[PDB]
Structures are given as C-alpha cells and as structure tokens.
Amino acid sequence: TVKDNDAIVPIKLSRTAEYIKDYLALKEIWDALNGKNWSQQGANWNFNKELDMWGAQPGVSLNSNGRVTGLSLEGFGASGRVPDAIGQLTELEVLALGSHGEKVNERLFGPKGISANMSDEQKQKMRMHYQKTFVDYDPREDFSDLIKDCINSDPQQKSIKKSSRITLKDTQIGQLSNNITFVSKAVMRLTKLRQFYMGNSPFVAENICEAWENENSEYAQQYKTEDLKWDNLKDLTDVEVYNCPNLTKLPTFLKALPEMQLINVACNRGISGEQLKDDWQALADAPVGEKIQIIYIGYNNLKTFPVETSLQKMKKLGMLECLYNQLEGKLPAFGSEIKLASLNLAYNQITEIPANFCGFTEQVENLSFAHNKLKYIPNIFDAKSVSVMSAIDFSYNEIGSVDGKNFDPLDPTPFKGINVSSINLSNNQISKFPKELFSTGSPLSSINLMGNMLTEIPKNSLKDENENFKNTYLLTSIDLRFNKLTKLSDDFRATTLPYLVGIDLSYNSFSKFPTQPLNSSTLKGFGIRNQRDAQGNRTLREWPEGITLCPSLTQLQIGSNDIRKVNEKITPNISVLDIKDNPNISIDLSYVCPYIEAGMYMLFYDKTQDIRGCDALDIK
Ligand code: NA
C-alpha cells in the first residue's frame, strides 16, 4: 500500500501470519452469525483474550501451527449469513453448519466424532451414525415375547436387543436448529475439506454456496481473481444437507463435486417428489454418480427413483435408505452389478421389486421392505449363497393377496430362495404356507408368519412326501399368531424339525390340540392362548396330556381358552405357566407349589379356578 503527502509514500505491509488471519476470519464468522447470542445445547466462543488465543474455541480444532482444521456450529443456534471470510480457513478438513445430530442432542463433529485427521475406523463409525440412529432395526423384534424369551435363553442364538431406532415426530420435520440464511461461495477455496454438513436451516437452495456473501468484501475481491472451482475439492467425500424446510430443490454444488461418497439429503420435504427424483438423476448422470457409496434420502416425497440407465451408472453404490417417502408401483432397477450392504425401503407404497433390482455384498446383516404394498416375495436372492444374512423384513405388505400366491407366478426363473437366518412375513395376506422358502434350502432358523390368512399347514409344507429339505433342521422359531389355524401336520414332529425351540400358535382356531410340535426334545416354549372360531367361541377345551414329558419345555401359555380336566400333575420344569382365564379348568399344582412359595415359579391364574394342591394361592 502507498499513501500521499504530491508525493507517493509506501506504507510498510503488516506481514500478518496465516494462523492469525484465520482467527480474524473466525471472529468475522462469529460476528456475521450473531455469535454474541449463541447458546449451546449439550458454551460460546470468547474473544476477550489475546489474538493468538482466538483459535481456542468450543467446536474448533487447530493444528501444531495454530491453523483451523475443523469448525462446527452444531448446537450454537447461529443466525445470519456465512461470510466470504470462511475462504481464509484453507486448512479446514471438517465443517458443520448444522447436522442430524442436533435433532437427537448429539455433537457429530468433535474429537470423539467427525474430526480433522481422524482414523479410517472413526470415519466409518461416524458415517454409520445416521444409520444406527434412524434406520437400523432388528426384524426379529416382531416375534412374540414367548419366542423372543426362548431366543434370548438360547446360547446358540444372538439375543434380541430392545429397540433403539428413533422415529422423527412431524414436529421435528422442518424444526430449525439455527437461522443460517446464506452460505458463501468461498467454501470452493477450502480445497482440503473432507466433510461438509448442514442441517435444520431456513436457507433456500440458490443461497447455498452460489454467490459471494458480500462481493465488496476484502475476501470476495481477492478470491474473485483466484478462479475457484468445485472440481478442486478432491477430498470432500461426506456431504449432508439435512432437514432444510425451505429447500425446493437440492443445492446445485453437489453434482459439481468430483469425489463425494456419502450424501445425506434426508427430511427435505419442501422438495417435490419429481424435483428430488430429477436432482438424484442429475447426481447419477454427473461424474460424481460413479463415486457415491452411501445415500440417506429418507423422510422425503419421492414417488419413484431415477431411470434404470441413470441408476446403473452408480457402480460404487453400497447403502440406500428411502424410509418414509411416497414410493409407488414397480421400482426402477440398479442391476445385479451394484452390490448393496444396506437396503431399507420401509414405509412406502411399493407394489413390486424388479428381478434385477440390485446385488448384495457378503457383509449384509439386515434388509427391510416393510410397510409397502408388495404382492410377492421378490426373487432377487439365492439360498445357495455362502454369505447368510441375519434377517429380512417383509412385514406389513400384501403378500399372498393376489390369488394366494406368495411368489410372482409370471416369474420366468423359479424362486432361488433366500440366504437369510430370519424372515419376517408378519401382517400380510398369506393363505398358503410359503413352502418354496424351505424347498430351495433357505438357511432359516426363524420365521414370523403372524397376522396372516393361514387356516392349516398341511402334510407336505416343510418337506416332500419321502424326503426332508437340506436346511429345515435349522428352523428353531415359528411365529404363527393371529391366523385362523385349525390344523398342523406331522411336519412339526422331530422327524423334520429336530431342533425346534419356540412355537407360538396364540390367537388361532384350534379345537383339537396340535400335539405334533411337542415331539421335539429341544422345545422350550409353546403358546396356544385365546383360541377362537369365526363366531367368537372358545374352541380349545383339550389339555395336551403328556406335555409334562417335554424334556426341555419351561414355558407353556394356554390362557384365555376353555381348558377342562388336566390329569397329569404339573412338573416344576414348566416354570412359566399361564392358565389364566380358563374358568372350567381342573389342575393339580401339588409339585409346583413349594416352587411358587419360594418365588421360583411364574404362574398366571384366577383364584376362582379349580386349582388343587396349593393353599398359598388363596383359591376361593
Ligand atoms: Na443449533
């Protein structure tokens, strides 16, 4: 700089250090975002200290040279426009203007979260944060308490954990965490940026890094001559634009990125289904389409996916979730070539999954197609695959509704089965037992058929007349609650099911006791509660005489029936017995009485019932 005294006088330049220039940027950012009125969830920045100490701030990470490497506004409640000063922080690896964490009172950015120069292991953990919080679920949860207790007691089985998945309340959708109304173009200068997160902001799509915050600023004027490009952000792999209610389209900078891998665009319900389909298509058609690996696009208005030819381009895709969208009809396909590790299409109105929808990685644990309008189980799996999935959720669909067929009769390829341990087919319209799951040799250890239209499981349903199937010996849990079952078959005896542990036939129409599953030496629990016919009459009057001879049986639920005379004395090994609401029962509990008094027994009964051998029960 020069001055006048006419005479030109050169003013010695203040050769200010970069880490100091960063701190003047931090203070300018704080000033622009109404920093004096910030108040953290679970603090504020403070500039009432020496200039070289201005790097020491909650939500800010520095390096050994004192340069800003991370900046998070999470929970501060920032209000204003992100100034062009942001472009000074060129050593920035992580940046958060908001996140999905703010909706669940969690800081995603920090030394234990998304941090500059973190381990690949920490990066993965953090990448999976949205998944563990809002998407992951165990489909075995829909098993009855009886069946879940038997699974949890079995050392040879993975116990079923209590549900931890959060579902957003429509109060939270569009609920702002900040009042950021503009984001400067200057972010294109941060060529070292690895993670860029924003969420719960009222800004519009065109004000997200399209223009200078103020084109007459010292920063804008400088960077104007720098030819900044989105192509130069070679390290930006994780981007999130979450729950921004005033978005009507996705910000255009996303398709301009060269190496984006994770994209979280969930809760943008201001964006029409058509517009989001078009923005997704645009991403697949751009060079970044080939790079994307994770898509979080739940809580949106999608009516369908982009065209198959655009989807096919996303070769690196491995995770897709579309929870709570408006997906209708037959879905466009990605192809077998695209291998998914996660897939969750629950809570839509999907009627068909195409033959070539996708492939799968050997790391697949759980998949979900729950809460849709599926007419059939999609033939996109292989029972012959070596990698066995944990569980697949097909609950709350319309499977078996079309002429009682559980599998597309117009499928040219015969059903290849499913390489999964657990199948959840509860709340459907299944009237015919899905035998083809077993004939193809699916390694099923548990099946949930609760809430269907079954009236009987006849003679050859789990086997062929003179031959058993390869893996039916694995089936240890059968949930058949809420059906209209009157009969089973010898398919349930130890000859076909030698390792059966739990069976729940509660809420069915048996009048004759299905004794066949009692042949198992491994059976731990049996449920046959509330047996009723169409007219509401209590059909089960027969006690399973001989059940005290089940060597492993410890829980019997036969309550709310019309059980009469019980000849055998109840044995102490049946430590959980529900006989409650059986007003005409006649049972001798002589042997279980000292166990009752010791608090070592669990009996559900009425003092009005004809119970013999236990005075301690206060029988009226
Ligand atoms: Na906030």
mmCIF file of N, CA, C and O and ligand atoms in Angstrom, residues 39 41 73-78 97-98 102 176-178 199-200, ligand 1:
data_model
loop_
_atom_site.group_PDB
_atom_site.id
_atom_site.type_symbol
_atom_site.label_atom_id
_atom_site.label_comp_id
_atom_site.label_asym_id
_atom_site.label_seq_id
_atom_site.Cartn_x
_atom_site.Cartn_y
_atom_site.Cartn_z
ATOM 1 N N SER A 39 -25.989 -19.930 22.219
ATOM 2 C CA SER A 39 -26.096 -20.644 23.494
ATOM 3 C C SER A 39 -26.190 -22.116 23.174
ATOM 4 O O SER A 39 -27.182 -22.534 22.573
ATOM 5 N N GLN A 41 -26.422 -26.367 23.285
ATOM 6 C CA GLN A 41 -27.336 -27.437 23.734
ATOM 7 C C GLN A 41 -26.599 -28.445 24.749
ATOM 8 O O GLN A 41 -26.779 -28.288 25.962
ATOM 9 N N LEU A 73 -20.601 -25.519 14.060
ATOM 10 C CA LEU A 73 -21.545 -24.598 14.665
ATOM 11 C C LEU A 73 -22.650 -25.343 15.344
ATOM 12 O O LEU A 73 -23.594 -24.703 15.844
ATOM 13 N N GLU A 74 -22.566 -26.700 15.349
ATOM 14 C CA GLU A 74 -23.587 -27.572 15.934
ATOM 15 C C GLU A 74 -24.027 -27.104 17.332
ATOM 16 O O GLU A 74 -23.168 -26.840 18.179
ATOM 17 N N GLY A 75 -25.347 -26.958 17.511
ATOM 18 C CA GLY A 75 -25.991 -26.583 18.768
ATOM 19 C C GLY A 75 -25.886 -25.146 19.235
ATOM 20 O O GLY A 75 -26.502 -24.790 20.243
ATOM 21 N N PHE A 76 -25.156 -24.302 18.503
ATOM 22 C CA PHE A 76 -24.956 -22.913 18.921
ATOM 23 C C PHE A 76 -26.159 -22.033 18.643
ATOM 24 O O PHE A 76 -26.355 -21.032 19.341
ATOM 25 N N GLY A 77 -26.945 -22.392 17.641
ATOM 26 C CA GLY A 77 -28.114 -21.608 17.276
ATOM 27 C C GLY A 77 -27.728 -20.342 16.550
ATOM 28 O O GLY A 77 -28.315 -19.285 16.781
ATOM 29 N N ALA A 78 -26.738 -20.465 15.648
ATOM 30 C CA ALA A 78 -26.207 -19.400 14.801
ATOM 31 C C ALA A 78 -27.316 -18.799 13.922
ATOM 32 O O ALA A 78 -28.233 -19.518 13.507
ATOM 33 N N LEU A 97 -22.348 -26.729 9.776
ATOM 34 C CA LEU A 97 -23.198 -25.549 9.953
ATOM 35 C C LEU A 97 -24.475 -25.967 10.654
ATOM 36 O O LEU A 97 -25.338 -25.155 10.983
ATOM 37 N N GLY A 98 -24.572 -27.267 10.863
ATOM 38 C CA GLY A 98 -25.698 -27.939 11.485
ATOM 39 C C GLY A 98 -25.604 -29.386 11.103
ATOM 40 O O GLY A 98 -24.772 -29.720 10.264
ATOM 41 N N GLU A 102 -28.140 -32.577 15.874
ATOM 42 C CA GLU A 102 -28.867 -31.527 16.598
ATOM 43 C C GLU A 102 -30.307 -31.940 16.946
ATOM 44 O O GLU A 102 -30.809 -31.535 18.002
ATOM 45 N N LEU A 176 -36.212 -25.942 12.927
ATOM 46 C CA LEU A 176 -34.914 -25.322 12.757
ATOM 47 C C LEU A 176 -34.066 -25.392 14.029
ATOM 48 O O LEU A 176 -34.606 -25.296 15.139
ATOM 49 N N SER A 177 -32.732 -25.568 13.853
ATOM 50 C CA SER A 177 -31.718 -25.594 14.924
ATOM 51 C C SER A 177 -30.882 -24.312 14.876
ATOM 52 O O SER A 177 -30.082 -24.028 15.780
ATOM 53 N N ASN A 178 -31.057 -23.553 13.793
ATOM 54 C CA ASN A 178 -30.339 -22.313 13.511
ATOM 55 C C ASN A 178 -31.127 -21.455 12.513
ATOM 56 O O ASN A 178 -32.096 -21.928 11.906
ATOM 57 N N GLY A 199 -27.625 -28.571 8.292
ATOM 58 C CA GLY A 199 -28.964 -29.044 8.590
ATOM 59 C C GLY A 199 -29.761 -28.153 9.497
ATOM 60 O O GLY A 199 -29.197 -27.361 10.256
ATOM 61 N N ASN A 200 -31.090 -28.281 9.403
ATOM 62 C CA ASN A 200 -32.135 -27.610 10.194
ATOM 63 C C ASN A 200 -32.050 -26.079 10.009
ATOM 64 O O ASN A 200 -32.314 -25.320 10.936
HETATM 65 NA NA NA B 1 -28.211 -25.309 16.722
#
